[PDB]
Design a protein around this nucleic acid. Sequence first.
RNA 1: UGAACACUUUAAACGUUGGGUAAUAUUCGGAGGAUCGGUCAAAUGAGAAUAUUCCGGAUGGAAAGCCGAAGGCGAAAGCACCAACAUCAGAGUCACUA
Length: 48
Amino acid sequence: ARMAELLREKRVATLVEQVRKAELEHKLAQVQLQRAVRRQEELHRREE
RNA sequence: UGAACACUUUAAACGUUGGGUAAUAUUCGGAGGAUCGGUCAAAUGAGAAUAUUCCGGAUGGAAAGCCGAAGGCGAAAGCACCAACAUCAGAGUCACUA
């Protein structure tokens, strides 16, 4: 039971956290970079 | 997926308020003196007091005649005078939400 838990559960869960967090860092690099410069240029040109 | 924002685009979507109309029968005076109505066809009547009509006037509300279409909007029934109030809705782009 301890072999199953510490040698499966925490590392398979760890795979799930780091995979969705690499995905979240992908989505967050998107929403910072392309979104932020696009919308500040749009708001800049719309107020001009 | 579902929903709110910023743009692009949509009309017979929805209720209220003001105004209009080809057209409608009734009526006030005038033209005109026996036809009109109507149907496969025939039959009460309008009419010898003036009928269809025609002139021009009033009335008052129906319905929106063409547009307009195997076109649109709608959840469906449905929705076809504008103008404005007005509350939406639906589609596309670009972003939020996880």
